[PDB]
Amino acid sequence: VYPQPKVLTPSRKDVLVVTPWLAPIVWEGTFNIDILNEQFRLQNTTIGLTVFAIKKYVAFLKLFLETAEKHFMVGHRVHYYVFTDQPAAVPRVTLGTGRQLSVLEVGAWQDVSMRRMEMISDFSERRFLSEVDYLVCVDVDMEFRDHVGVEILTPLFGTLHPSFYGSSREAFTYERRPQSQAYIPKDEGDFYYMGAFFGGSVQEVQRLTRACHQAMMVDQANGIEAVWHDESHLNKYLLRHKPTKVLSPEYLWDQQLLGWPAVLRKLRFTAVP
Amino acid sequence: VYPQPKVLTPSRKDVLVVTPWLAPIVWEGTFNIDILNEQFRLQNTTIGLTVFAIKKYVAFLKLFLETAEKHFMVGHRVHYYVFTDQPAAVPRVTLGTGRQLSVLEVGAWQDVSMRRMEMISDFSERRFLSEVDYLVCVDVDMEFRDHVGVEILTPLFGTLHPSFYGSSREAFTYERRPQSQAYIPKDEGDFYYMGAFFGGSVQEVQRLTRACHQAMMVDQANGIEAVWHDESHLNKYLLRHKPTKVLSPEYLWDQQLLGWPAVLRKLRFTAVP
Ligand SMILES: CCCCCCO[C@@H]1O[C@H](CO)[C@H](O)[C@H](O)[C@H]1O[C@@H]1O[C@@H](C)[C@@H](O)[C@@H](O)[C@@H]1O
Ligand SMILES: CCCCCCO[C@@H]1O[C@H](CO)[C@H](O)[C@H](O)[C@H]1O[C@@H]1O[C@@H](C)[C@@H](O)[C@@H](O)[C@@H]1O
Fold this sequence. Notes:
2 copies of one chain form a homodimer. The first copy, chain A, is an alpha/beta fold. Chain A has a single domain, classed as Spore Coat Polysaccharide Biosynthesis Protein SpsA, Chain A (Alpha-Beta Complex), CATH 3.90.550.10. Chain A contains 6 helices and 10 strands; from the N terminus they run E-H-E-H-E-E-H-E-E-E-E-H-H-E-H-E. In chain A, the strands form 2 sheets. The first copy, chain A, has an 8-stranded mixed β-sheet. In chain A, strands 6-10 form a two-stranded antiparallel ribbon. In chain A, strand 2, helix 2 and strand 3 form a beta-alpha-beta unit. In chain A, helix 3 packs antiparallel against helix 4 and helix 4 packs across helix 5. In chain A, 45% of the residues are buried. The complex binds a molecule of 2 linked components (BHG-FUC) (2 copies). A molecule of 2 linked components (BHG-FUC) binds next to loops of chain A.
């Protein structure tokens, strides 16, 4: 039993909650988590979370994982995959039942710019992910402050960049040179998505990360680096293959930079100052 | 090129546009048809529409089909399947390119109450629907007045009953006897869906119509007829298997009964007076 939805009452009066292609934009007040948790638990949903922690960023893993255990997908099956050049430096964090962590070592400047999309592409294709239903790909220099759960899950999602959710499209920092595979013309574009939080089913994350990696290789062969690297390619991809959910900036925020505006009812996953 | 969606501007301020399980509720102003038409045409989407026209209701087929040709899925591949006890009386209506019609003869009072779900179940399982991607199941005593297009398409959809979209759940005319397979308790239920317009992918319409038919057979064996026949079973089904889109009453209206309220910007598919 849960409160009856009310057809004549908007779920939010201050923000857009569905895109023009009918993908939900996920804000607090738009979902009932009990119904979603039931639907996803009925499928024994397993969520993989990938995170890169390279060089001095390995220091952010302790708080990232401690707070993920408090707030990410609690009650569902979770497997963290930590990609790092220092596997020995991964903190031993105690995990709830049904949750596990694997450490994946990274080897070996444009190839580093390509590393995230290349490595997730290769990894997402492996047979040991047979049990994993969705992949969520986030940055490590962050903490969870509030619920991040199965409301986000869908075949393909991106996240509204916290600096640009209010901007008109010509102000978006899309790649603007026609020479680059990431090019988006002045008059095109739905949203500016941030590279720090995207995901989807395993098949849709294989497709996204393969397309971004292959596009970046083409740019490198031509001597061009997109203005915001794999984020520029992510935006080009999501423009052409529209996400089936879009996460609001509740899911990717910087409070030191941007404070706490009235349109954010919760700050769920935030930059570490 | 299309107008940029505006994150800080609700798509509607007067109605709920997403359910608590994050399924879009389809109202005018919530979608951009050009983007949807592109996505669906890229998949060469074929829509089957089923309609029953029995005894004197065969008289409603001429206006139903003439207006469907003006307003239903125009530009996409459509196949009408007319189920009738008078195949000879089906009007010869001229169809646009890419659109065809087949006539399916019905044979042979509780078995008539079961006929729609039984017949669609049997039909949806046939190999000649290999090319068909979605099934839309509507009543014949209706006309199209305005656009009904691929915005509705999704794995599973129901339609808000025009008499009840404003009602609280205890006022819903759900089956209330625990003896019936359609039973829904006082404190349960999201919406009251009408049996006159439901649909989804072929697989989801096989599942819905098989479950409703099998449930109604169980009730008949027990000497119970649900209060609103297959509509009572439809509601029980959609309560347990939540629809991935819900159509607003723009898609199922009676203007003689209910007029033209401010929350309806378009009257798309309406009862014939
Ligand atoms: C003091 C730096 C403020 C920069 C705000 C704009 O954010 C940056 O936007 C570009 C695209 O234009 C990239 O997405 C870049 O990674 C963003 O900066 C990072 O995210 C912001 C929100 C803030 O946390 C910065 O400190 C990060 O470097
Ligand atoms: C004069 C009759 C007014 C009835 C309004 C309520 O609609 C009926 O609701 C039940 C469930 O409670 C069934 O869904 C039934 O089929 C509905 O009646 C039909 O639809 C209404 C909207 C109107 O067009 C009636 O004339 C139909 O019989």
